Amino acid sequence: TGGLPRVQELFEARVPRGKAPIADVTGRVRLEDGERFYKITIVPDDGGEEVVYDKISKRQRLRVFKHEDGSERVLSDGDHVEVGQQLMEGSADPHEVLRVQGPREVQIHLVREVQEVYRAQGVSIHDKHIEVIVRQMLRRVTIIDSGSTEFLPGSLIDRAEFEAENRRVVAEGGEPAAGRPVLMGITKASLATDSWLSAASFQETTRVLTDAAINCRSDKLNGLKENVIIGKLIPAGTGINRYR
Amino acid sequence: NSVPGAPNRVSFAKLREPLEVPGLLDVQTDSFEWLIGSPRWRESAAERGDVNPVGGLEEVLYELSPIEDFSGSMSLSFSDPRFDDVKAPVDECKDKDMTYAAPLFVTAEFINNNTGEIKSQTVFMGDFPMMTEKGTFIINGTERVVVSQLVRSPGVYFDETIDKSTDKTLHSVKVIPSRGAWLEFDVDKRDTVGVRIDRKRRQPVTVLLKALGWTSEQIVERFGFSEIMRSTLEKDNTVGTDEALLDIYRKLRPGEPPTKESAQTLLENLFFKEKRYDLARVGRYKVNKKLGLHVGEPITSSTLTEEDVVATIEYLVRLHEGQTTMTVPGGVEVPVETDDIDHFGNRRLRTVGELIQNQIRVGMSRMERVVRERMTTQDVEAITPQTLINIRPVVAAIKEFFGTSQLSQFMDQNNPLSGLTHKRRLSALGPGGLSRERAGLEVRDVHPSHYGRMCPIETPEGPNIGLIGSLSVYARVNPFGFIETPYRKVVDGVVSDEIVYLTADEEDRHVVAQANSPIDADGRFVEPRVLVRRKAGEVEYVPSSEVDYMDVSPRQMVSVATAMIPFLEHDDANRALMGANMQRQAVPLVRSEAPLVGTGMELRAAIDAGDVVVAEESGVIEEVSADYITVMHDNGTRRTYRMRKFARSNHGTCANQCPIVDAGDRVEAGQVIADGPCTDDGEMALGKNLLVAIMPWEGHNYEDAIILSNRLVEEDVLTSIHIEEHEIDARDTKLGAEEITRDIPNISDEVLADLDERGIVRIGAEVRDGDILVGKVTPKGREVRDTSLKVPHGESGKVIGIRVFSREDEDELPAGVNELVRVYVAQKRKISDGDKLAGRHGNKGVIGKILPVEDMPFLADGTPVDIILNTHGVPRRMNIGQILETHLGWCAHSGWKVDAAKGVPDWAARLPDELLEAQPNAIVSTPVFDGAQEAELQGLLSCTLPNRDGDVLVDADGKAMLFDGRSGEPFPYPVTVGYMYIMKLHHLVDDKIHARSTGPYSMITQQPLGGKAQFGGQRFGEMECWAMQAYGAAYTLQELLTIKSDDTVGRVKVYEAIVKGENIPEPGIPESFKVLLKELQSLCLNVEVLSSDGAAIELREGEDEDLERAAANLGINLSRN
Amino acid sequence: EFIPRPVKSSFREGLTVLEYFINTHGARKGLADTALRTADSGYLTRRLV
Amino acid sequence: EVIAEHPVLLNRAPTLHRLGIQAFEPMLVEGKAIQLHPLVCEAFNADFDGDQMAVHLPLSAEAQAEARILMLSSNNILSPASGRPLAMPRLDMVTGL
Amino acid sequence: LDVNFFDELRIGLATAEDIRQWSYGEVKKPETINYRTLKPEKDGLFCEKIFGPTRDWECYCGKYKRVRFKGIICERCGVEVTRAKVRRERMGHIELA
Amino acid sequence: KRLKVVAAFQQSGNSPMGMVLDAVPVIPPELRPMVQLDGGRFATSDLNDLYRRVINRNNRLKRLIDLGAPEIIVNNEKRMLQESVDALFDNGRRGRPVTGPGNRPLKSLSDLLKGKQGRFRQNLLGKRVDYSGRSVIVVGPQLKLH
DNA sequence: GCTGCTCTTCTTTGCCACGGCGACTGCCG
RNA sequence: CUUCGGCAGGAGAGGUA
DNA sequence: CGGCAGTCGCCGTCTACCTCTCCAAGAGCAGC
Ligand SMILES: Nc1nc2c(ncn2[C@@H]2O[C@H](COP(=O)(O)CP(=O)(O)OP(=O)(O)O)[C@@H](O)[C@H]2O)c(=O)[nH]1
Ligand SMILES: [Mg+2]
Ligand SMILES: [Mg+2]
Ligand SMILES: [Zn+2]
Structure with a gap:
């Protein structure tokens, strides 16, 4: 019962309730001891701006991580931080991890966090079964500037189409588009498929049908669900061209 | 005891019962007596x-x-209801399919204020259904039961919450009425007492007080001991009841005529009138005892006063400020506390009388509108009471309630216990209660205030778990609707014999001791410290100085189905729940012998159920047969009783009654005279006693399977009769009426050999599947078709009765019908593989094998066992009462005698007399919580009488040495043997097997139909598609989804290819896709199927040479010659 | 939470009446889970598929 | 002789994983109940206290070949999630051994 | 009509001309079926002239009741002599004021 | 947000004049059949009375207009016709649902496709099939694994 | 003035979970 | 070669694994 | 002008099977 909630959270990619800040730079920690605010400001090592990590009430503790020496301890004033670290205690933000550390770190985080819940109850699933889900969860990019690529700023389009359009415009042209990796849930990535038949048969039929009708969409009929619905052989197993 | 002719069943109990179990059907009959106004109720x-x-x-x-018009010159009033005699007896109503009811008459008087003439006459108001002697209603010939509803009482409910921020404790109130709008005070983040009147807005409350009339000086003098009130008063911005009143008037309804006349109207018609706000008498009594207002003085009137509107806010403010006691000018001191909406002091019971009175009230309220309207249309001096009353809404409401409702339910008639448990049942659902997904997890749990009122064990296990319960044995219902339980008063340390009925509210103020307290035979507790139940459900130890009540007995907290499980305290809760629920699915057997070891509840649960015949007066029996009994009374009057022989029940079982008295016996009032379906000599008996061996056996009892003997089939130990009814009708057709005769157009004469002259089968004939029962022909388009009653598939039996109703022969038939025939077919079903068996302790399983007698394990003298059970399912399920019952059953069957030549053994010190010596085949009784301890069982197992020879088969541990029936070598270790009580459940494999190759199809979509009644297919849902996609099987899935389901053209081709022996052709297109396309088009959407170069495919059928070159209905039908 | 009053008797000796009453709270939570919280797992399975 | 070497598909609800459907070789028995092998009760999650199962019949040649090769009950012994065996002795057989 | 030839599925808004092109006639009477003769009324929701014949190779009047008279339109009723299965693929329309 | 719609209507060849209707299609009669009850009264068909209301208020508006009634009456009639059409397409979206016998909301065209009981999730992703049966299972400790 | 056929549905009392996400809309600063 | 003639929607309640 | 935060409205809530009952009425308008 307890276990499932957390799993669902993780997969949907929602903002954790009991969140924790993640260190953004690396230098000397500055815990400006307050009452209901254990503010940590941390000025950089080389130099730069500063992160106002505040609004952390005393309803959670601090990381008892292996302190920067070899031996473990808790957090105070005068500490050395490294890019990526749970300053507080709780469940970190996958979006923040993706923005700061990178896709490899976010995949590690997600796989470990999901595996712990099932492993605590005595259930053994190979890791390769969650890699496909995590791979499906991050395949899109966000557009900041468009120029000649006719992409709506702030929209989300697939990586392959992004690279194809960028290469097409960079030839006989000079304005590559810029993108940023994004992290998706399992519902909002399911509702953003190319075919409208599968999306309409998944959820929210009226909205999907309205958008498809307005946008004049076309279905290529190259999936398992569409081939099941219309009455063809699914393109998997004994129904692929090599064996048939 | 207390029954004139009960059998002798010795008991192991150690306590004494000061109280007798009440009438088990009073909850149903008392409410109807109150509603009718019977002399008995008075x-x-x-x-x-x-x-x-x-x-x-x-x-x-x-x-x-009275009903008066706008002018005020005429009025109409009613009084004096009366009931006539019943139209027809119960038996004729069940036979001829009509309702059991009596006419209702009332007298109405018409008042003419102007002149003064008086018109008074009695008016008819419909037929009112009446309750029979067993608490059931007969509607259109079917037995029905109206269950009780668990609802929340009207009143005030102060609640407290929590926060997700600042963490300040917010409070609120809620004046929930019975018919009206809801008020809703509350505090918030800052000090802002608001009033979301009628579910909307958020105005301050000072506006309300001012508007009402409370002048600033008074409001600030009285409501000025907390900074909350004075700070809300400051920022009010409202000054002048005019301004206030108008502010709220405008607020309630935006953009409206702001006339002050209709403003004062609204205000004094919202919470103060007499036809739009109706706090009942329970809600008024509950409001005038929470706040402390006018106590004692009659509960006349039913509208909210302003004193209690002020008191509500005073109580709220006090609560918020922490002060845990207050007293309003005029009252008593009342604790300032919060409320529990699940407490049994806040939930009441809507019994059958209230449930039907609500519908009568609705009908009368509807008729009042027509009555009032008719006064402005007719003319004075021509107005008569028989001209203003329309009695159609009332009868419509009554008929709509008694049929097609969620609380009047089809009665359960598997056995007497199921029928007796269908009533005494409390339902949390219905029109005004919870839902099956809205209900959360706090209303489907056990509360500490359920003790002695609702049983914590008996409940469904599906999606209805926690929403349905059963009344306890000793409980009764208040006049207001609250459940009561009896307690025995102990004063000054001595336990009296005065019994006091207490509700939860009164119970949570005292300390209640336990029934198993050590009384010193004079009322004095032996031990100073005793166990008690305190206010919050906590259990603590107190000295015997402040104890003031005591439980009347153990088993007070269990229901009537749970109180029939021996050794209940040794079973876990889930197994006991399953056993209690499974006892009501047992089928009535042909013999029904009584249990060897049982509880004391089987005698009184059969008399109150009503399925046995009970003598009404003392007398001497004159003559006895198998159809009637005649008893001659002491004053010379004679009374004869008739018996029901082979009558069909609601669920298809057989109900039989057999006399158990001789031709010279003397009877007394209350003595049982005839038996019933599951009754043996007056006691409830649902199973048989079988010899049990507990051991694994060659894998035939793997995973809850059961091995059975062949003697149980040879001697018809577990056999049951099952009856079925079939009906047909002859209706008028445009092309001519239909008729019943043996003139079936051109058909062989070897199939019309059992039909008599009129064209109905003959009594005593054996019918199979596909045989003519009633021959009928209908004019087609001497137009003679053939539509006859044939026996449905899989059925077979003996015709046992026929009933014919014909229009001509003065019969109240329907409209357009000329003849109705009903045929009854009976069968005798034996036990076989796949049938379900169970015990009383949660055991259940399916017959895996039936073994010959000569290859079953047998004892040293050659006695084979009857049933083998596995030992791997006992310890992990925590139901060890079955082994204790097995040991005690062996001890009771064999007989015993404790050797007491020198004194009495220490283990038999507490045993009563007449329990030191028993004869073979004795019957004993172990009460539910006071029974045989393990010490007495261990002692009795070692003093047991031998068999016909001088041998002792079962040693002191309850184990016997067995031989093997296939090889002959003895088993190397002893095995546990004994006697157990086994019941046959109504889940038989003859009613579960189904198969289909081709049959009827649906009309919109061309998929096979669903169900077993008609040849229907099995749904291949979404998850099976996922499994077949994960396997990789792409041809099996395609064939399953197109050819077998929707490909209308490929079905007949596949059939012909299979029949002629050729290859299976390619599939085509399904029909559901085309239906979807048509619907999408009909939603003004332009959907089209394209090709490799545009050119939308038409998708229009195709000229087919679909000529039938086989002529043999693929399946949609059958076959005739 | 945990009730500070334990049950000192086993199912071989037999529980008392209050001991048996305070033990029926744990059987409702465990039969009301099978019927109510299986939706939370079958909706997740459908979304995952 | 018409039911010889013609596989059938057996299924129990709910079908939680791939081994909720398996193919068997039918034999004719007396009675109205289906007999099921003890060792396949772990994949199906079946016990003998009132359970029921559904039966389906492949028709074409490709369907028969798929049922006989891909979905046969004697070819699926290991779990497709971890590789641990599923058709192995349990309960009574473990006690005997 | 082979399903293997399907290439795409397009959706979009439909205008009044498309709606009037799909239709075969306009309904103008709210009546559905006569309760006495059990036959659909004229120019109703179940009309034979616009939706199709109710019986195979039959007309509303009775002049044509044989297969060889298919295709032609009756001179009095105006219904088409064809299959009765054409009643689940013909549409109508309502002309709003 | 606004360009997400304007560009959609600009790129393609469609016109924005598809949201205002001038004619309404009618589904084939075989997809909305009427069923006899005990050889007596009809059991209604939900879809067949919404069309009835539409036709009724359309012929009323047409006659009022053809005779030349004042503006207020024709405006009220047009409002009522619009509400009836909206109830036909999606019943309960705005205002109170159109009820039938026994206070039961009627079933609209848009309810034939959505939900667990809609067409998509009940008749296209899972079906009923022929050559299928069902019975109770027991244990045979004599068979082989196949 | 008969009874079968036919047509039609708005004041007046009824009305009765919980989390997540996004538009929006008066509203204060 | 067999002329006409002959069917299957919703709502509610209770159960089994 | 310019943020802005509460609020409300719409989306979703496991699979397969068995038994039973009930399904508008009132008022006006004919053709004799
Ligand atoms: N999808 C659903 N399946 C159910 C439901 N109720 C019962 N079942 C099925 O019945 C099965 C219950 O079997 P058990 O409680 O005996 C589990 P197990 O045998 O391993 O434990 P023991 O009783 O101790 O032997 C459960 O696994 C389901 O397959 C339900 O509400 N929904
Ligand atoms: Mg099991
Ligand atoms: Mg089971
Ligand atoms: Zn014609």
């Missing part, structure tokens, strides 16, 4: 202190009358 209500006895219909009539 007597019972006059024996107790009551101001004035008001009935159930006269109260509605008094709340209705």
Whole structure:
């Protein structure tokens, strides 16, 4: 019962309730001891701006991580931080991890966090079964500037189409588009498929049908669900061209 | 005891019962007596202190009358309900399919204020259904039961919450009425007492007080001991009841005529009138005892006063400020506390009388509108009481309630226990209660206030778990609707014999001791410290100085189905729940012998159920047969009783009654005279005693399977009769009426050999599947078709009765019908593989094998066992009462005698007399919580009489040495042997097997139909598609989804290819896709199927040479010659 | 939470009446889970598929 | 002789994983109940206290070949999630051994 | 009509001309079926002239009741002599004021 | 947000004049059949009375207009016709649902496709099939694994 | 003035979970 | 070669694994 | 002008099977 909630959270990619800040730079920690605010400001090592990590009430503790020496301890004033670290205690933000550390770190985080819940109850699933889900969860990019690529700023389009359009415009042209990796849930990535038949048969039929009708969409009929619905052989197993 | 002719069943109990179990059907009959206004109810209500006895219909009539118009010159009033005699007896109503009811008459008087003429005459108001002697209604020939509803009482409910921020404790109130709008005070983030009147807005409350009339000086003098009130008063911005009133008037309804006349109207018609706000008498009594207002003085009137609107806010403010006690000018001191909406002091019971009175009230309220309207249309001096009353809405409401409703339910008639448990049942659902997904997890749990009122064990296990319960054995219902339980008063340390009935509210103020306290035979507790139940459900130890009540007995907290499980305290809760629920699915057997070891509840659960014949007066029996009994009374009057032989039940079982008296016996009032379906000599008996061996056996009892003997089939130990009814009708057709005769157009004469002259089968004939029962022909388009009653698939039996109703022969038939025939077919079903068996302790399983007698394990003398059970399912399920019952059953069957030549053994010190010596085949009784301890069982197992020879088969541990019936070598270790009580459940494999190759299809979509009644297919849902996609099987899935389901053209081709022996052709297109395309087009959407170069495919059928070159209905039908 | 009053008797000796009453709270939570919280797992399975 | 070497598909609800459907070789028995092998009760999650199962019949040649090769009950012994065996002795057989 | 030839599925808004092109006639009477003769009324929701014949190779009047008279339109009723299965693929329309 | 719609209507060849209707299609009669009850009264068909209301208020508006009634009456009639059409397409979206016998909301065209009981999730992703049966299972400790 | 056929549905009392996400809309600063 | 003639929607309640 | 935060409205809530009952009425308008 307890276990499932957390799993669902993780997969949907929602903002954790009991969140924790993640260190953004690396230098000397500055815990400006307050009452209901254990503010940590941390000025950089080389130099730069500063992160106002505040609004952390005393309803959670601090990381008892292996302190920067070899031996473990808790957090105070005068500490050395490294890019990526749970300053507080709780469940970190996958979006923040993706923005700061990178896709490899976010995949590690997600796989470990999901595996712990099932492993605590005595259930053994190979890791390769969650890699496909995590791979499906991050395949899109966000557009900041468009120029000649006719992409709506702030929209989300697939990586392959992004690279194809960028290469097409960079030839006989000079304005590559810029993108940023994004992290998706399992519902909002399911509702953003190319075919409208599968999306309409998944959820929210009226909205999907309205958008498809307005946008004049076309279905290529190259999936398992569409081939099941219309009455063809699914393109998997004994129904692929090599064996048939 | 207390029954004139009960069998002798010795008991192991150690305590004494001061109270006797009440009538188990009183909850149903007392409410109807109150509603009708019977003399019995008047007597019972006059024996107790009551101001004035008001009935159930006269109260509605008094709340209705008088009816006056806008002018005020005429009025109409009602009084004096009366009931005539019943039209027809119960048996004829069940036979001829009509309702059991009696006419209702009332007298109405018309008032002419101007002149003064008086018109009074009695008016007819419909037929009112009447309750039979067993608490059931007969509607259109079917037995029905109206269950009780668990609802939340009207009143005030102060609640407290929590926060997700600042963490300040917010409070609120809620004046929930019975018919009206809801008020809703509350505090918030800052000090802002608001009032979301009628579910909307958020105005301050000072506006309300001012508007009402409380002048600033008074409001600030009284409501000025907390900074909350004075700070809300400051920022009010409202000054002048005019301004206030108008502010709220405008607020309620935006953009409206702001006339002050209609403003004062609204205000005094919202919470102060007399036809739009109706706090009942329970809600008024509950409001005038929470705040402390006018106590004692009659509960006349039913509208919210302003004193209690002020008191609500005073109580709220006090609560918020922490002060845990207050007293309003005029009252008593009342604790300032919060409320529990699940407490049994806040939930009441809507019994059958209230449930039907609500519908009568609705009908009368509907008819009042027509009555009032008719006064402005007719002319004075021509207005008559028989011209203003329309009695159609009332009868419509009554008929709509008694049929097609969620609380009047089809009765359960598997056995007497199921019928007796269908009533005494409390339902949390219905029109005004919870839902099956809205209900959360706090209302489907056990509360500490359920003790002695609702049983914590008996409940469904599906999606209805926690929403349905059963009344306890000793409980009764208040006049207001609250459940009561009896307690025995202990004063000054001595336990008296005065019994006091207490509700939860009164119970949570005292300390209640336990029934198993060590009384010193004079009322004095042996031990100073005793165990008690305190207010919050906590259990603590107190000295015997402040104890003031004591439980009347153990088993007080269990229901009637749970109180029939021996060794209940040794079973876990889930197994006991399953056993209690499974006892009501047992089928009535042909013999029904009584249990060897049982509880004391099987005698009184059969008399109150009503399935046995009970003598009404003392006398001497004159003559006895298998159809009737005649008893001659002491004054010379004679009374004869008739018996029901082979009558069909609601669920298809057989109900039989057999006399158990001789031709010279003397009977007394209350003695059982005839038996019933599951009754043996007056006691409930649902199973048989079988010899049990507990051991694994060659894998035939793997995973809850059971091995059975062949003697149980040879001697018809587990056999049951099952009856079925079939009906047909002859209706008028445009091309000519239909008729019943043996003139079936051109058909062989070897199939019309059992039909008599009129064209119906003959009694005593054996019928198979596909045989003519009633021959009928209908004019087609001497137009003679053939539509006859044939026996459905899989059925077979012996025709046992026929009933014919014909229009001509003065019969109240329907409209357009000329003849109705009903045929009854009976069968005798034996036990076989796949049938379900169970015990009383949660055991259940399916017959895996039936073994010959000569290859079953047998004892040293050659006695084979009857049933083998596995030992791997006992310890992990925590139901060890079955082994204790097995040991005690062996001890009771064999007989015993404890050797007491030198004194009495230490283990038998507490055993009563007449339990030191028993004879073979004895019957004993182990009560539910006071029974045989393990020490006495261990002692009795070692003093057991031998068999016909001088041998002892079962040693002191309850184990016997067995031989093997296939090889002959003895088993190397002893095995546990004994006697157990096994029941046959109504889940038989003859009613579960189904198969289909081709049959009828649906009309919109061309998929096979669903169900077993018609040849229907099995749904291949979404998850099976996922499994077949994960396997990789792409041709099997395609064939399953197109050819077998929707490809209308490929079905016949596949059939012909299979029949002629050729290859299976390619599939085509399904029909559901085309239906979807048509619907999408009909939603103004332009959907089209394209090709490799545009050119939308038409998708239009195709000219086919679909000529039938086989002529043999693929399946949609059958076959005739 | 945990009730500070334990049950000292086993199912071989037999529980008392209050001991048996305070033990029926744990059987409702465990039969009301099978019927109510299987939706939370079958909706997740459908979304995952 | 018409039911010889013609596989059938057996299924129990709910079908939680791939081994909720398996193919068997039918034999004719007396009675109205289906007999099921003890060792396949772990994949199906079946016990003998009132359970029921559904039966389906492949028709074409490709369907028969798929049922006989891909979905046969004697070819699926290991779990497709971890590789641990599923058709192995349990309960009574473990006690005997 | 082979399903293997399907290439795409397009959706979009439909205008009044498309709606009037799909239709075969306009309904103008709210009546559905006569309760006495059990036959659909004229120019109703179940009309034979616009939706199709109710019986195979039959007309509303009775002049044509044989297969060889298919295709032609009756001179009095105006219904088409064809299959009765054409009643689940013909549409109508309502002309709003 | 606004360009997400304007560009959609600009790129393609469609016109924005598809949201205002001038004619309404009618589904084939075989997809909305009427069923006889005990050889007596009809059991209604939900879809067949919404069309009835539409036709009724359309012929009323047409006659009022053809005779030349004042503006207020024709405006009220047009409002009522619009509400009836909206109830036909999606019943309960705005205002109170159109009820039938026994206070039961009627079933609209848009309810034939959505939900667990809609067409998509009940008749296209899972079906009923022929050559299928069902019975109770027991244990045979004599068979082989196949 | 008969009874079968036919047509039609708005004041007046009824009305009765919980989390997540996004538009929006008066509203204060 | 066999002329006409002959069917299957919703709502509610209770159960089994 | 310019943020802005509460609020409300719409989306979703496991699979397969068995038994039973009930399904508008009132008022006006004919053709004799
Ligand atoms: N999808 C659903 N399946 C159910 C439901 N109720 C019962 N079942 C099925 O019945 C099965 C219950 O079997 P058990 O409680 O005996 C589990 P197990 O045998 O391993 O434990 P023991 O009783 O101790 O032997 C459960 O696994 C389901 O397959 C339900 O509400 N929904
Ligand atoms: Mg099991
Ligand atoms: Mg089971
Ligand atoms: Zn014609």
